[PDB]
């Protein structure tokens, strides 16, 4: 079910941090992705949220905790999203 690519080349970094980014109530997962001085920083924040009506971001302050500081050092100008059916 690895329909993301078709070829695998020489890779320079690989990580498998087991702890991953995780009844009527739903959840809101906020993430902040950035890349500065080579290091690629990822901040995450998970919070339960009750359904309102126009399905928008809730009003409130919730800081995102620093999660990953992957040292990559590449040029990133485009990104996409990988959702599952």
């Amino acid at each position: 079910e690895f329909r993301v690519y078709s070829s695998a080349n020489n890779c320079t970094f690989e990580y498998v941090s087991q702890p991953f980014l995780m009844g009527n109530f739903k959840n809101l997962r906020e993430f902040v992705f950035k890349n500065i001085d080579g290091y690629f920083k990822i901040y995450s924040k998970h919070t339960p949220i009750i359904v309102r009506e126009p399905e928008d971001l809730p009003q409130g302050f919730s800081a995102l905790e620093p999660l990953v500081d992957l040292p990559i050092g590449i040029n990133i100008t485009r990104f996409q999203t990988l959702l599952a059916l």
């Binding site: 001085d37 080579g38 290091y39 040292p71 990559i72 050092g73």
Partner: protein, 49 residues
């Protein structure tokens, strides 16, 4: 092995570590000492000296 030590194969490993603009990820060993508090000591932590 019927020969002398002069012309025997010596397994050779060459280390190549060139520094570039990429962030460093592999460094050398970091020695450490025991902590003793309640006295004025020169602390030399990671980035706080």
């Amino acid at each position: 092995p019927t020969y002398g030590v002069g012309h025997q194969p010596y397994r050779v490993v060459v280390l190549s570590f060139e520094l570039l603009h990429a962030p460093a990820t592999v460094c050398g060993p970091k020695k450490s000492t025991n902590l003793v508090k309640n006295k004025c000591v020169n602390f030399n932590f990671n980035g706080l000296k």
